[PDB]
């Protein structure tokens, strides 16, 4: 499903209102992993060592890989969504998605396996349309020290990391990770946050199609209280350089403004899915039983 | 009655031909319900929470409980078959028949009440040998997201709903008339075929009951197995099933087998793809319909 702004495409769009954790299953399997490059993965090793010469402190972290997502039959007795996930890493991401030869990898991939992403790490990111009690969406200015989308506008992010029921632990890890990041980066108490709702999955084409799962999260605080909580942490309590707010009523028309050029690809996917899927009621995160 | 597959036993085999709906009566009574477990129904509650953690989409719904069945001599006035039914639920079903203690429950029941099923929920399922105009039986492959027998090949079937006779909810035995219950059993069969195969009701004949088989992996849970004919051919049936794409249904494929092969069906590698309840339907079909 192609959207406007060619930086962004939609892999998954959930039905209206979004989907809760309880209606989602995950399948985590080696069959969902990246395919070994044509040929040899030491090309990844070469890039990793070429970087790391310039930045010796770089560390490789494990990530979930998105292979595919399938919506179930409308109003069915099973889960409404199945996520097929593999394992990948930051090292493989730098060596494939962000490598110069990334364009070569997608063509050879769709040729060989009939899937452009077959030779790409495709780590699954997470993002959130965080809505305030007085109906604003929260945005964050990225610090200029980052190589990816420097100085641009973002939404609260995250990165889940790997640790029947196995699939539910993964589903749980994904949903928990967006709450954990909102608390850490925006400095909000967990009590003030609703249970997240998945809105869909968007692909960043500037990243050669890395997907990001986009969630809706409601905050019981007003836009003024959030800002205070954010600032009260001080410059070192968050890795963004500042926060601001846009009325939910103005979010739909937002792409007319000069702000859209400020937004990073991930945040765009979040806004687009928010406008299309919209929100629905959920209770306090603390009121839901943890697994 | 040993059926020959240790996964299947026959509780009842109908005459003919199979029995039409007009010849069958149901009696509901709280005496046909499950006896309260010695430990308690709290053991059922613990198992329910555990199953929900793995599959949150599971829902508890009321079910008919099969207690027993009795045939009468043909020519006798009134029903030739009486089904004695209780009320149970999907929660009780997972907490008893699919409990790890199931074998221990069947023993306690045998000792105490002289009935292996005494402490088991035993919801009554329905299934259908569905023949097409060009003489194939129809088969469907189960999803992996089901609570039991994931990924196995099955016949059309499902659970009759007591809540269908009294939409008010929380059903009592006195709220459910015998003839309406028998009707719900026969109608749930036709409706399952319509919903999962996307076949029009007008193409389906009135189901004939072949008998009742037990699923020994589910600790003897019983299913009623019906014979139903379709006026459409295998090809047309496949087309109907295919409209809407793979996500039109939760089943993952439709398959056809010649009725002549059905007789020998379990000398074939197809047999090893079948869940127990589908094995029950084939064994009764072969025996009652040929
Ligand atoms: O009350 C219910 C009923 C169904 N489900 C779920 O929806 C699915 C419905 O499957 P269904 O086929 O209707 O019941 P099963 O118990 O899963 O399957 C058994 O019952 C069917 C009809 O009796 C047979 O065809 C199958 O072979 C037999 O395995 C179940 O797996 C469950 O996941 C519930 O959560 N609560």
Swiss-Prot record, chain A:
Keywords, ordered alphabetically: Hydrolase, Magnesium, Metal-binding
All copies of domain Nudix hydrolase, residue ranges: 121-277
Motif (Nudix box): 167-188
Organism field: Homo sapiens
Listed cofactors: Mg(2+)
Name by which UniProt lists this protein: Uridine diphosphate glucose pyrophosphatase NUDT22
InterPro entries according to UniProt: NUDIX_hydrolase_dom (IPR000086), NUDT22/NUDT9-like (IPR055295)
Biological role: Hydrolyzes UDP-glucose to glucose 1-phosphate and UMP and UDP-galactose to galactose 1-phosphate and UMP. Preferred substrate is UDP-glucose.
Species lineage: Eukaryota, Metazoa, Chordata, Craniata, Vertebrata
Binding site for substrate: 59, 90, 142, 147, 154, 159, 161, 266
